[PDB]
C-alpha cells in the first residue's frame, strides 16, 4: 500500500507526527534546562519518550511509502519510492533523529528536534485545508511566540544555574529557599522573565555582570526583531483580511464622488446607493467571470451546468438540441442583477440580448398603466425573437413588449452574437432554433 | 584583473565589492569607536594603523584599477574599449565621492595628533556599499533573507552609533558625576551598548536623567527610538507583505471561488475537484495563470519563451515539417495551457471537435469503451481530425480520458482561423497537406 | 407591519438596541467584580436592568417581525417570518439572553445579544460619511472594553487573593485612601492600561498565580497592541490609497518625461495639468469609474447626466428617443487645457463635440481673433462628419477652435458613431438629412 | 484690481507666509498660556510677534477676498463676485472669528493672560492647505510626509507637555510625587528646566514608554490613563505612517521584483535553457537600470488625448524627421503616425525579422544600432543606425515585383536597440481617411521598391 500525500490518511499521519515533534521541542528543552522536571517525572518521560520514538520510527516507515507525482500519476513502486527517499536530505535528517545516543541526561536526545519538517508540513497542510485561514495564522503566530518565550525561559534558567543561583541580583534566586525552590515557581518565574524581556518591557532586575549584560542585550535584540515580525505579520493579516472591504468602499466612494460631481439627481443617487447596499448585504459584490477567469473551461462548465442546466433544460428553444451546445450556452451566459421597478426594456428599444430568469420575478407591464399581464417566475425566458431576428415577421425593429422587474431579479443574459459563436460548430441546431422561433412568433 | 569587468556575470567583481564593503564597514563601525572610546591606546595604535592602511589601499585600488574597468552601455551598444571605460568612470558621479573620500587627512596627523575625526571623510564612499547591496540582492535567490539581515545590520549600527554618542555625553558630563552618565565599572562598550539598546528600543528601566543636558539627550534619543522601532516594524511588514504576496493572492482567489461555489450551492465532489485543481496548480506552477504573466512581456521574449518550450514538441511530431515558420510562431503564441484532473474527458466520442491537443507533462489514454488502445505519453498529438475540417465535419472517434494530471496545450479552431486570415498562402499549402494526409 | 431590514426605522432600532447591549457588557462585568457599585446604586441598576430587559424582549419581537428576501421580494407573511426566525441560531441566542435566572453574576447571559452591537457597527460603517473616523471610534471602543474587562479581572483576582496581603494586589481597602470606589476603579483601570499596553510601572507579582496572570496579561496586551497597530496601519494605508495611486501616476509620468527627454514647456504643461487635476479633484477617470456598475445603472446615469445638457441645443433636438439613449451612452467626455487647439485647419476631423461647462472660441490661422465664442451647451463638429459637399475639401476643418479656459467637451468619434448608426436605417436617413439641413444653414 | 491666482506661485509664497504665524500661534499660544514665565519675561518679543501675526491675519483676509475661482473654465476676475464667494463660505466666519479684537480684554487683565488669544488658532485650514500644496508641489514627497508627521506629533507632544504643567500648577507644585517639583527650589525653578522636563514627561507618556513617577491622586490617575490611551493611538499612527512610507518608497521596486520572480518561476517550471534564461534576466535588469520597465501605454493612460499627442510629438518627431522618406508629408499624417508607434526594446543577438517571412511590421530605430546579416551568422552588410529605417517594403504588398511581401534580409541587433514598432494594419488604418497621402506613400514605396 502506498500512502498518497494528498489524501486524508496522510493528514491523519501529519497530525500524529506533529504531536510528538512538538512534544520533543517543548519538553526536551524544558527537561534539559530545569533538572527537577527531568528527575521527578521520570516514569512519565520514559513512557512519552518510548511513544515518541515509536512514532518517529513509523514516520520513517511512512516516508518510505509516501507516493510522489511523476508525469501526473502516482508512483506505486516501493523500490522506486525507497530510492527516491534515500536520495533526499530528509532521509539523513530522519535517520539522524533516531541514533541511539543512550535517564540522567535528556541532552543526549536533542537530535529528536531535527524532524521540524513534519511540524511545518502539518501547519502548511492545516492552513491550506481549514476554513479559517486568518484564525489559523493567529494560532500559528501564537504558537511560535510561545515556543520562543519557552526556549528563552529555559535559556535564562540554564544561564542562571551556570552563573550561580542568587549570587547576583539578576539571576534566578537561591534554590535552597523553599519559596523559590519549587519547580512551579522556577518555571513560572523564568517564563515571566522571558516574557518581560522578549516583549521589550523590562521590569525585571537589571544585569550586574558582563555576561548578564551581553545576554540581556542579545535578548532585547532578539525580542525587538521577533516582536517586529509579529506586529508585521498581524498587520499584514488584518490588511489582507479587509482588502476586499476596502476595495468595495473605494468603488462606492468613487461612484459617490462622480455622482456629486456630475449632479446626478437624488432619486438615481439613492437607487445606486441602495443597489450597492443590496450587493454588499447579499455578497454578490464580485464578478462571475472575474472570479472564474483562472479556472479552465472544463471546471467552469462543470460549475455552469451544475447551476444553470436546471433552468435551461426547460425552455422552448433548447429542449434536445445538443448536450455540448448546452454546455457552451451555460459557459457563455452572463449575469446582471436588476433593481425593483427597473425596466429591462421598453417599447422602442432594439433587442440584442436574451435573458434567462434565475431567482427573480418579472412583469410584462403595459406602456401607460401598470398592469401585470403575467408574472414571469424563475426559469422563464425572453429576448428570443430579438436574438433570432427572423425574416417574414412583423419586423418592426423594436421589442414588442415591456419587461419590468418587481423585485431584485438576477437575470442571466445571453447575446445573439455569443449565440452565433456558440452555434458555429453545429449548423443543424441553428436551423432548428430558427424554425422554433418562427413557431413561437406565429403562436405569440 | 581583466581588461574589462562585466559586473553582472562576475563573481570576482562581487568579491571585490565585498572587499570595498568590508573596508567601508570598518570605517563606519570603527570611526566613532576610536573617536569616543579609549580603544586607541599606545600599544594598539600600530594595529589601528595597519588595518587603516589596508582600508586605504582597498579604497585606492578600487578608485584606480577596478572602477575604471567596468563594462557599461552607452546608447544601446556595450563598451569594451578600455580608454572609453576610463573616460566614462572619470566623468561619472561615483568619482566625485571617491576622490572626495580618499583625501589624505592622515597627513594632518602631525597637527592635532592621531584623531579619527580626520578620517571621517572615509565614510563618504557609501555608493560602494549600496552597489554591493543591489548586486547581492540581485544575485540572491531569496532577497527577503538579505533584506532581513540588512535591516538587522542597520539596527545594530544605529545602536552602536548611539552607544558612542552616550559615551561621549558621559565623558562630557564626567564619568560617574550624575546618576544618568556611565559609571565606569565594567566593559565600557558593553554597558554603553546596553544603555543604547534600552533607550533606542524604547524600553526604559535605566537611571532617570538628572540635569538638563541629560533630559535633552534622553528626550531626543527616545524620539529617535520611536522612529527607529517604527521603521523596523515597517521594514518587517514590507518583507512579509512582499514575501507572502503570491501565496496571499493565490489564497485570495481560492477562497473567492470557494465563496462563489458555496453561494451558488455547488456539491462537494465538484468543490473537491476545483480544490484539487487549485492545489495541483500551486504545486506545479507556483502561480495562478501563466498567460497573465506572459501578457506583460514584450513580443520578442514572448516568442523566444514560447519557442524554447514548445518548438521541440511541435517538431518532434512527424506531421509538422511542411508548415511555415511564421504560422508556427503565431500558433505557438496562440496556444492555451489548460490542466485536466485524473479521469476527465478531453474528447467524448460523439461531441463536436474544435481543438488540437498538444500534450505536455501528462499521460492520456484513448478508450475505443474502456479498453486501452494506445496510451498517449507526453509530446504526442490528438484532436487533429476535427481541426482541419470545416463546420461540424467529423466527430470524435474514441473516448479520450486523462489518466494522470495531464497538462494539455490547446489550439482552438477559431484562433486557428484568426491566425489563418493573415496567411493566405500558408492556408493554401496547409489545406493541401490536409487533403494529402486525409 | 413588517420592519424592512434595509430601512431607516430598522437602523433606529439598531441604535436603540445597541445601547443596552453596550451597557450590559460594560456595567455587568463592573458590577459583578466591584461589589460596591452593585451594592450602593441598587435603584439605578434595577431601573437600567428593567429598561435593558424591556429592550431585549422588544428586540425579540422585532426580530420576529423583520423581513427577508426570497426571489427578490419582501416577505410579509408573519408565520413565514417567525419560522425563518426560529430556524436561525439568533432566536436561540435571544431566548438564552432572556432567561430570568434572578449578584449580577446570574445576569451574565444578557451579554449574548452581541450580534446586535456588531450589526449596528457594520451598518454605521456602511452608512456613514466618515467611515475611517467611525472605524477609529469603533477600535477605541473595543480597546476600552478590553481595558475595562481587564481592570475588573484584576480587581476580582485581587479580591480572591486578599486585599493588601501582597504588593501586587490592590491595597488594603480598610484604609480610606484605597477604600473609595472611585479609587478602586481608577487604580484598576490604571493597572490594566499599564499592563495591556505593555508599559509596566506596576508592582511585580509575588505568587505563582500572580506571575501567571501577569504573563497571560502581557501576551494578551502584545496581541492587543499588534491589532491596534495593524488596524490603524490598514486605515492609514486606505485613507490615502487614492492619493498614493495618483502620486504614483504623477511620478511615472515625470519619470517618462525625464527618460524620453521631454522639453521644459511640455513638462511644465503636463505639471500644470496634474496640478489642476489635483486641485479640482478629478484625480480618477470616468472610464474606470464607470466599469464596475451594471449596464442598466450606467445607461440611467448617462441619461440623467447628459440628456439635460444635450437638449440645450435646439437643432440637435430632432432625434429619436432610444437612439439618444444610445448616443448619451456612447458620449465620452474629455477636458482640454487653456490654449489647447481642439482642431486646426489641416487635420481631418473624426470627432464631434458637445461643449459642457466650457468656453471655446474660433480663431484664424495663427491669429487670435474672435469671430464667435461658443459656450456651454452649444456644439460643433457636425459638418465634417456626415460626408457632405464641402468647399473642395470633403471632411476638413474650416476653422480653428482653441480653448479659452479649462473647457470640457463630449467627444463623439466618427467610426464610434457610425458603427451604431448603421443599425437604425430610417432614423439615420432622418439624421443625415438633418445634417444636410445644417450644412445648408451654414454654407453651401 | 489685482486678482491672485490660486494655482500660481504667488499664492504658494502667501501660503508659506501664512503658515508661519499660524504655526507660531498654535505652539507659543499654548506655551505662553500654561507656563507663565514665558508671558512675563519675554513680553516685548511677544508684543512684536503678536503684532506680526495679527497683521498677517488681516492680510490673509484681504488675500482670500481676492483668490480667484473657476466657473466655466475661466478664472473669475471681478471683485464683487470674489467678495461674495468669500462671504458665503464658512472660512470667512473662521477668519473674522480669528481676528476678534480680544486685545481689549488682554489689556484689561494686565498683559499677562494670552488665554484670550486662543481664537488665533482658528486659521488651521491655512496650515493644512500649505502642507497639502507642498506635498503635491515638492520633489521629495516621502521626506515631506515624515516632516509633516513629525510636526504633527510634535504639536501633540508640546500641547500635552503644557497640559501636564498646567495640571501640576493646578494641583500644586511638589505636593505629590507625580506633579512637577517645587519651583522655589532653584534647580526646578528655571524656565528651561520647566519646559524641557515637561516635554520629557510628555514624550515618555505619549509614546507609551513610561519612566515617569506614578500618580497619587485620582485626577492624576485619570489624566495619566487618558494620556496613555492617546499615546497608544499616537504610536499606532507613527507606525502606520512610517510603514506606509516604507511601503511606498519602494513600491515600483517591489512590483519589478515580483515580475522578476514570476518570470523566474515560469522559467524554472517549463525549464528553458540557461542561455535564454540569463538573456531574459539581463534583459529585464537592463530595462530596470535604464528606467524604461513600465510600458508607454500604461504610463500615458491617465493623460488626455491632447497631452498624449503633444508628448508623442515632442518625443518621436525629432526621430521621425530624420527618416529620409517621410519628408514630404503633412501634419495630420505625422500626428497619427507618432500616435500609432509602440516602442519595443531588443537585446543583443536578437532577431528583428528573418529572411523569407511575411512582413507585418515597420520599424524606426531610435537609440539603437542594428545590422542586416546573411543566413550564415554575423556578417555585417549595412549597419542600420539611429534614425534610420527598415521594414517599409514588405508591408505595402506591392505585387508584380520579384520580392512581393517577403522581407529580403536577416536583421539582428548589435547593441540594446529600442525600435519603434509601426504595424501594417496600424498603417493601413492610418491611411484609410487620407487617400492622397495613401497614393503618395505608394509612390514613394514604388521609388524605394525600384531601388530594391
Ligand atoms: N411581445 C412580447 N414579448 C414577450 C412576451 N412574453 C415574453 N416576451 C419577451 O418580451 C420581449 C421584450 O423584448 P423583445 O422585443 O426583445 O422580445 C420580446 C419577447 O422575447 C409577450 O407576451 N409579448
Ligand atoms: N480512435 C483513435 N484515435 C486515435 C488513435 N491513436 C491516435 N488517435 C487520435 O485520437 C483521436 C481523438 O480525437 P479524434 O476523434 O478527434 O480522433 C482520434 C485520432 O486522431 C487510436 O488508436 N484510435
Ligand atoms: N467653418 C466654420 N465653422 C464655424 C463657424 N462658426 C462656428 N463654426 C463651427 O466651427 C467648426 C470647427 O469644426 P468643424 O469643421 O467640425 O465645423 C465648424 C462649425 O461647426 C464659421 O464661421 N465657420
Ligand atoms: N533587403 C534589404 N532591406 C534593407 C536593406 N537596408 C535596410 N533594409 C530594410 O531591411 C528590411 C528587412 O525587412 P523588410 O523586408 O521588411 O524590408 C527591408 C528594408 O526596409 C538592404 O540593403 N536590403
Ligand atoms: C542560599 O542559602 C544557603 C542556606 O540558606 C546559603 O548557604 C547560600 O550561601 C545561599 N546562596 C547564596 C548565593 O547566598
Ligand atoms: C487592613 O487594615 C485594617 C485596619 O486599617 C487592619 O485591621 C487589617 O489587618 C489590614 N489588613 C491587611 C491585609 O493589611
Ligand atoms: C517649596 O519650597 C519652599 C522653600 O524652599 C518651601 O517653603 C515650601 O514649603 C515648599 N513647598 C512644598 C510643597 O514643599
GROMACS .gro file of N, CA and C in nm, chain B residues 87-133:
model
  141
  531UNK      N    1   3.726   5.694  -1.946
  531UNK     CA    2   3.661   5.823  -1.962
  531UNK      C    3   3.521   5.825  -1.901
  532UNK      N    4   3.449   5.712  -1.909
  532UNK     CA    5   3.315   5.706  -1.852
  532UNK      C    6   3.317   5.709  -1.700
  533UNK      N    7   3.412   5.639  -1.638
  533UNK     CA    8   3.420   5.643  -1.493
  533UNK      C    9   3.476   5.776  -1.443
  534UNK      N   10   3.570   5.836  -1.516
  534UNK     CA   11   3.623   5.966  -1.476
  534UNK      C   12   3.520   6.076  -1.490
  535UNK      N   13   3.429   6.066  -1.586
  535UNK     CA   14   3.317   6.160  -1.596
  535UNK      C   15   3.189   6.103  -1.537
  536UNK      N   16   3.199   6.026  -1.429
  536UNK     CA   17   3.083   5.974  -1.358
  536UNK      C   18   3.068   6.045  -1.224
  537UNK      N   19   2.957   6.015  -1.156
  537UNK     CA   20   2.931   6.073  -1.025
  537UNK      C   21   2.975   5.984  -0.910
  538UNK      N   22   3.027   5.865  -0.940
  538UNK     CA   23   3.098   5.789  -0.837
  538UNK      C   24   3.233   5.850  -0.807
  539UNK      N   25   3.299   5.906  -0.909
  539UNK     CA   26   3.436   5.952  -0.894
  539UNK      C   27   3.444   6.078  -0.809
  540UNK      N   28   3.336   6.156  -0.804
  540UNK     CA   29   3.331   6.272  -0.716
  540UNK      C   30   3.335   6.228  -0.570
  541UNK      N   31   3.255   6.127  -0.535
  541UNK     CA   32   3.253   6.074  -0.398
  541UNK      C   33   3.383   6.002  -0.365
  542UNK      N   34   3.440   5.928  -0.461
  542UNK     CA   35   3.561   5.851  -0.433
  542UNK      C   36   3.683   5.941  -0.415
  543UNK      N   37   3.701   6.041  -0.502
  543UNK     CA   38   3.814   6.130  -0.483
  543UNK      C   39   3.787   6.230  -0.373
  544UNK      N   40   3.661   6.247  -0.329
  544UNK     CA   41   3.636   6.326  -0.210
  544UNK      C   42   3.651   6.245  -0.082
  545UNK      N   43   3.646   6.113  -0.092
  545UNK     CA   44   3.665   6.028   0.025
  545UNK      C   45   3.810   5.994   0.051
  546UNK      N   46   3.893   5.982  -0.053
  546UNK     CA   47   4.026   5.925  -0.034
  546UNK      C   48   4.128   6.037  -0.006
  547UNK      N   49   4.080   6.158   0.021
  547UNK     CA   50   4.164   6.274   0.053
  547UNK      C   51   4.245   6.251   0.180
  548UNK      N   52   4.377   6.246   0.171
  548UNK     CA   53   4.456   6.205   0.287
  548UNK      C   54   4.467   6.315   0.392
  549UNK      N   55   4.368   6.319   0.481
  549UNK     CA   56   4.376   6.394   0.605
  549UNK      C   57   4.456   6.320   0.712
  550UNK      N   58   4.510   6.202   0.681
  550UNK     CA   59   4.605   6.134   0.768
  550UNK      C   60   4.743   6.198   0.764
  551UNK      N   61   4.768   6.288   0.668
  551UNK     CA   62   4.887   6.373   0.674
  551UNK      C   63   4.867   6.492   0.766
  552UNK      N   64   4.744   6.515   0.814
  552UNK     CA   65   4.716   6.615   0.915
  552UNK      C   66   4.726   6.555   1.056
  553UNK      N   67   4.785   6.435   1.068
  553UNK     CA   68   4.810   6.374   1.198
  553UNK      C   69   4.919   6.445   1.277
  554UNK      N   70   5.002   6.526   1.213
  554UNK     CA   71   5.106   6.598   1.286
  554UNK      C   72   5.052   6.721   1.358
  555UNK      N   73   4.936   6.772   1.318
  555UNK     CA   74   4.885   6.894   1.379
  555UNK      C   75   4.813   6.865   1.511
  556UNK      N   76   4.713   6.777   1.508
  556UNK     CA   77   4.630   6.750   1.625
  556UNK      C   78   4.635   6.603   1.666
  557UNK      N   79   4.748   6.537   1.642
  557UNK     CA   80   4.766   6.400   1.687
  557UNK      C   81   4.688   6.299   1.606
  558UNK      N   82   4.691   6.175   1.654
  558UNK     CA   83   4.613   6.066   1.594
  558UNK      C   84   4.467   6.086   1.635
  559UNK      N   85   4.388   6.140   1.544
  559UNK     CA   86   4.247   6.169   1.570
  559UNK      C   87   4.171   6.105   1.454
  560UNK      N   88   4.078   6.013   1.480
  560UNK     CA   89   3.997   5.957   1.372
  560UNK      C   90   3.885   6.048   1.322
  561UNK      N   91   3.872   6.170   1.373
  561UNK     CA   92   3.782   6.265   1.309
  561UNK      C   93   3.842   6.322   1.181
  562UNK      N   94   3.973   6.306   1.161
  562UNK     CA   95   4.034   6.335   1.032
  562UNK      C   96   3.995   6.232   0.928
  563UNK      N   97   3.977   6.107   0.969
  563UNK     CA   98   3.940   6.001   0.877
  563UNK      C   99   3.790   5.991   0.855
  564UNK      N  100   3.712   6.086   0.904
  564UNK     CA  101   3.568   6.081   0.888
  564UNK      C  102   3.520   6.123   0.750
  565UNK      N  103   3.610   6.144   0.654
  565UNK     CA  104   3.573   6.151   0.514
  565UNK      C  105   3.580   6.015   0.445
  566UNK      N  106   3.632   5.912   0.511
  566UNK     CA  107   3.632   5.779   0.453
  566UNK      C  108   3.496   5.713   0.454
  567UNK      N  109   3.400   5.769   0.525
  567UNK     CA  110   3.265   5.717   0.524
  567UNK      C  111   3.182   5.771   0.410
  568UNK      N  112   3.240   5.853   0.322
  568UNK     CA  113   3.171   5.911   0.208
  568UNK      C  114   3.157   5.816   0.091
  569UNK      N  115   3.219   5.698   0.097
  569UNK     CA  116   3.209   5.602  -0.012
  569UNK      C  117   3.092   5.508   0.007
  570UNK      N  118   2.973   5.562   0.034
  570UNK     CA  119   2.856   5.478   0.059
  570UNK      C  120   2.802   5.413  -0.067
  571UNK      N  121   2.838   5.465  -0.184
  571UNK     CA  122   2.788   5.410  -0.309
  571UNK      C  123   2.847   5.274  -0.338
  572UNK      N  124   2.964   5.242  -0.282
  572UNK     CA  125   3.016   5.107  -0.295
  572UNK      C  126   2.937   5.011  -0.208
  573UNK      N  127   2.888   5.057  -0.093
  573UNK     CA  128   2.803   4.971  -0.011
  573UNK      C  129   2.667   4.952  -0.074
  574UNK      N  130   2.612   5.056  -0.137
  574UNK     CA  131   2.481   5.039  -0.199
  574UNK      C  132   2.489   4.962  -0.331
  575UNK      N  133   2.602   4.972  -0.402
  575UNK     CA  134   2.625   4.886  -0.517
  575UNK      C  135   2.640   4.741  -0.475
  576UNK      N  136   2.704   4.717  -0.360
  576UNK     CA  137   2.714   4.580  -0.309
  576UNK      C  138   2.579   4.528  -0.264
  577UNK      N  139   2.496   4.614  -0.204
  577UNK     CA  140   2.363   4.573  -0.161
  577UNK      C  141   2.274   4.538  -0.278
   0.00000   0.00000   0.00000
